Amino acid sequence: INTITYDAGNTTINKYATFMESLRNEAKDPSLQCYGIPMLPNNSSTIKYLLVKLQGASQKTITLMLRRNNLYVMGYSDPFNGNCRYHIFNDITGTERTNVENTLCSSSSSRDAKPINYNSLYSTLEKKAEVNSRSQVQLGIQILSSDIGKISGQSSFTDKTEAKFLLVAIQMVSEAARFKYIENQVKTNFNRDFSPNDKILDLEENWGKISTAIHDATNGALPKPLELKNADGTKWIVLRVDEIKPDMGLLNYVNGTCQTT
Ligand SMILES: *[C@@H]1O[C@H](CO)[C@@H](O)[C@H](O)[C@H]1NC(C)=O
């Protein structure tokens, strides 16, 4: 397993761009692409996971563990009282839950559990964060850095604080890797807090559908119109791969053959 590192507390646009490229390159199957967009591996690859080590306020760190097959965050660890403190979502099942603990903490000599007492669905995180929608949760570099400090090394924090941290980190790491559009929103707003627009949220919700549509396209034509949203919330109807391609960073794994270029 490899670790991609990113210091959100002392950074620049160009450093975040490099981080995104590194994350995409570690996540993707080296051999799979459709229409020149790299695709994630199936769930039976030899290297199943990846670590993303984030640094933030007061140089405190959190490590995210991501599944390569779909880039979902499985849990995170923080240095706490000399221990690898591992936090896993409450629906991560049996032996994979064992694997997440062992993967997060392998080089560490001591560990302690602090479970995430909920699952990773956006609806769940929004409920825990006490917001109507993650549209209401500002994103940004400084926010990410500060949120890291509210969790890492802290003996106590509320589920709300955690869920807001997770909304920010999941979108700025996994969703940004999946979507160049979302990466570009971060970079455009690099020096400020921003409210994610309707296109960010819509892309996040439709990644699977988009990945299927692109994979199953013949000579660039999507089998059915894809109903998405523009940045200002208006309806965006996509008919061909080239219309959506510039927004894509990674495709979800989809079995079968596709036009690779
Ligand atoms: C960021 O890091 C650079 C290089 O180590 C350092 O010179 C600078 O003071 C840091 N920025 C701040 C204000 O933390």
Curated annotation (Swiss-Prot):
List all annotated glycosylation positions: N10, N43, N255
- A Pfam family hit: RIP
- Please give one Gene Ontology molecular function term for this protein: toxin activity
Q: Where is the active site?
A: Y72, Y122, E175, R178
The free-text tissue note of the record is: Expressed in leaves (at protein level).
Alphabetical keyword list: Disulfide bond, Glycoprotein, Hydrolase, Plant defense, Protein synthesis inhibitor, Toxin
Q: What is its EC number?
A: 3.2.2.22
Q: Disulphide bridges in this chain?
A: C34-C258, C84-C105
What is the protein's given name?
Ribosome-inactivating protein PD-L1/PD-L2
What is the enzyme's class at the highest EC level? Answer: hydrolase
Function of the protein: Inhibits protein synthesis. Has adenine polynucleotide glycosidase activity on herring sperm (hs)DNA and poly(A) substrates. Cleaves supercoiled pBR322 dsDNA.
